[PDB]
Design a protein around this ligand. Structure first.
Ligand SMILES: O=P(O)(O)OC[C@H](O)[C@@H](O)C(O)NO
Ligand SMILES: O=P(O)(O)OC[C@H](O)[C@@H](O)C(O)NO
Ligand SMILES: [Mg+2]
Ligand SMILES: [Mg+2]
Lengths: 215, 213
């Protein structure tokens, strides 16, 4: 299947977010309420975005660290389809969020970061987690960290374990061929779409490139 | 003496105010819980600091990435302190700290779930002076108790030079487990907010801390 495209709305206010969505809502598959938007506006951002775009998958990038059932329920009651749980959360946090996700016919992704282990990845699978987000951190990127070999190896191994893998972190169009040949579920682009001279054409470029590389 | 912090793990400001109108003057630190950060957003920090400008306000944002951006949003809303989750990239913690210094604030690393001693030394090397030793709410709900391994870890963190906050379903009766350790802050959320008498609950915590330290 072609990798899907997710836009990250890492905006501090809803109106800033809408400057993007009014252009590209129908140019992407998934609309993410970025952590920065969740923190800027609260869970109303999920409710309002889903109300505008009820046919789209809406992902709340809550990066849940604890209180899995409470935070997940807040997001799902606001009509989220998918929610994120940070990988260092206690395993009961992920399990809790998943339990609530199932109630709402939604799903949970584990957001990968820090010194996570392959034993922990197996724990997520045994818990029934089917999605992981492989993130090059914005702050690592800013400190000069590049996408490379070790990332491809890890992503392939996560996929082989049965996860649908999302890839993100300052992706540019030129980065996509690094991942060719791997059944990536979703690529997220935030800055590379929102900050482009033409967000519509940036999103279209990503779609064209994906269609060529995975066609 | 260890300070007393109340956690406002509420979904709306009006629910938080049900607690702060009783106990704001009975604690040292008012926490905007992660639940409140997600429920209302950074307006919660702004509003609570305006109400209680003489109290330390902690935004329990549990920052996982975009350290400079998220911490600036909290500090522009007049936070004193902000949390960064322990598995954040080291550059996220450094970024949040750099911004905190612009505002004469501080960053705490939230030790909830998995982390390593090597990471602890990294935080120290980066200039981080505060950690929050948590028993995860979800771990507690799964029957995990406070135990000697926690005490040993807290002492170790203190010995590395961190000011240590202790939290996670703390009851009054738990305080003596930590006796002898120079704890910076004890946090209570449920044990204060959900008490038949929140005022009595907060004062009992302060009374006990004063006895033990
Ligand atoms: O493409 P970016 O601007 O890096 O945004 C996507 C990224 O996944 C962010 O939403 C994020 O969650 N960073 O932690
Ligand atoms: O005393 P509690 O109800 O456990 O609340 C304090 C705790 O520190 C929470 O604010 C929290 O951050 N749990 O992850
Ligand atoms: Mg995101
Ligand atoms: Mg908290």
């Amino acid at each position: 299947s072609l990798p899907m495209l997710q836009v990250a709305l890492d905006n501090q206010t809803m109106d800033s977010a809408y400057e993007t969505t009014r252009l590209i809502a129908e140019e992407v598959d998934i609309i993410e309420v970025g952590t920065i938007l969740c923190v800027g506006e609260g869970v109303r951002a999920v409710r309002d975005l889903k109300a505008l775009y009820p046919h789209k998958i809406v992902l709340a990038d809550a990066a849940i660290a604890d209180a899995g059932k409470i935070l997940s329920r807040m997001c799902f009651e606001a009509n989220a389809d998918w929610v994120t749980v940070i990988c260092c959360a206690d395993i009961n946090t992920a399990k809790g969020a998943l339990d609530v996700a199932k109630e709402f016919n939604g799903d949970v992704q584990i957001e990968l970061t820090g010194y996570w282990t392959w034993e922990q990845a197996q724990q997520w699978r045994d818990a029934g987690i089917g999605q992981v987000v492989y993130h090059r951190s914005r702050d690592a990127q800013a400190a000069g960290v590049a996408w490379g070999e070790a990332d491809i190896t890890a992503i392939k191994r996560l996929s082989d374990m049965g996860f649908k893998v999302t890839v993100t972190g300052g992706l540019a169009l030129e980065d996509l061929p690094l991942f060719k040949g791997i059944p990536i579920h979703v690529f997220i682009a935030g800055r590379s779409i929102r900050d482009a001279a033409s967000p519509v054409e940036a999103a279209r470029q990503f779609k064209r490139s994906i269609a060529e590389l995975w066609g």
